A paper describes a structure:
In a decameric RAD51 ring without the bound linker DNA, in addition to its nucleosomal DNA binding, an NLD of a RAD51 protomer in the RAD51 ring may also contact an N-terminal tail of histone H4. The H4 N-terminal tail extends toward a RAD51 NLD, and the H4 Lys16, Arg17, His18 and Arg19 residues are located close to the NLD. The interactions between the RAD51 NLD and the H4 tail may not be observed in the RAD51 rings bound to the linker DNA. To determine whether the H4 N-terminal tail region functions in the RAD51 ring–nucleosome interaction, we prepared nucleosome lacking the N-terminal residues 1–19 of H4 (H4 taillessΔ19), and performed the RAD51 binding assay in the presence of ADP. We found that the band that corresponds to the decameric RAD51 ring in complex with the nucleosome without the bound linker DNA was specifically decreased with the taillessΔ19 H4 nucleosome. To ascertain whether the basic Lys16, Arg17, His18 and Arg19 residues near the RAD51 NLD in the cryo-EM structure contribute to the decameric RAD51 ring–nucleosome binding, we prepared nucleosome lacking the N-terminal residues 1–15 of H4 (H4 taillessΔ15), and performed the RAD51 binding assay. As anticipated, RAD51 efficiently binds to the H4 taillessΔ15 nucleosome as well as to the wild-type nucleosome. These results support our conclusion that the H4 N-terminal tail directly binds to an NLD of the RAD51 decameric ring.
Residue numbers in the entry:
A (entry chain E): 38 to 133
B (entry chain F): 18 to 101
C (entry chain L): 21 to 82
DNA sequence: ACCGCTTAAACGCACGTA
DNA sequence: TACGTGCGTTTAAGCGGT
């Protein structure tokens, strides 16, 4: 039976998702998360649809960029695998 | 009348985080990344939403608008185009 | 009788805020309950939102 | 907010190897 | 030795109506 070697399909996915623009997190859980977080700041809140979509576009753009920097940190350490310490270095240097 | 308390962050699933990382150009991913990512996401969301709601409250509204979010993002140096 | 502040934790007050209330010296839901907002706010690491959540959930419990 | 149906994605596991 | 790949199962996201 056929099996691709470790890495081939990963690269295929990179090309695939860098080619496209669709949101990568599921709508409903993201919305649920947003409402949960919002509740600890202000009671009785409602949300415009486009407000939740705005938050998702912003969040996903942020995470993708962070993963770019994280990847650079992993490669810097002569690895190809990203690890929490890569994220933490990236966020420290960003001033986060 | 009642509506129940909930916990959500785990709804941002492993394959979703993987897709985000792929778009970020990542080829291989440690198992510990996912939880880490979730924490990071939560912090981000919290900050933005905290500001957004502040704007909402100033306008004496109960509905967070797209503009509330846009202003929060702008004032955090993360300008977003497309939702004005 | 008493309502130990532990039960407040199931209402969804985070456990760190309950530890801050015990450090302040509040050990029961009775203790948080019959106090105004400002008592909990003056405690280190407690915002006005957490104090409102505590009083509301304590009024649910008490 | 809810009901129902569908199906594709998630998940658990086995295994080999990078 | 931990992670990628593949496969069978199950779970829930998605879509459509109201």
């Amino acid at each position: 039976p056929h099996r691709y070697r470790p890495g081939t399909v990963a690269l295929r996915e990179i090309r695939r998702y860098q080619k496209s623009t669709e949101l990568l997190i599921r709508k409903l859980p993201f919305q649920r998360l947003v409402r949960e977080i919002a509740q600890d700041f202000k009671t009785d809140l409602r949300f415009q649809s486009s407000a939740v979509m705005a938050l998702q576009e912003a969040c996903e753009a942020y995470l993708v960029g962070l993963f770019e920097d994280t990847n650079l940190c992993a490669i810097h350490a002569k690895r190809v695998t990203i690890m929490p310490k890569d994220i933490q270095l990236a966020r420290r240097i960003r001033g986060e | 009348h009642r509506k129940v308390l909930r916990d959500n962050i785990q709804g941002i699933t492993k394959p979703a985080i993987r897709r985000l990382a792929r778009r970020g150009g990542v080829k291989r991913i440690s198992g510990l990344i996912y939880e880490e990512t979730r924490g990071v996401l939560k912090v981000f969301l919290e900050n933005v939403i905290r500001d957004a709601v502040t704007y909402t409250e100033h306008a004496k509204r109960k509905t967070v608008t797209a503009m509330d979010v846009v202003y929060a993002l702008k004032r955090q140096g993360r300008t977003l185009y497309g939702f004005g | 009788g008493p309502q130990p502040i532990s039960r407040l934790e199931q209402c969804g007050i985070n456990a760190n805020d309950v530890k801050k209330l015990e450090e302040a010296g509040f050990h029961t839901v009775e203790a948080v309950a019959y106090a105004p907002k400002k008592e909990l706010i003056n405690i280190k690491g407690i915002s006005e939102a957490k104090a409102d959540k505590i009083l509301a959930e304590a009024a649910k419990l008490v």
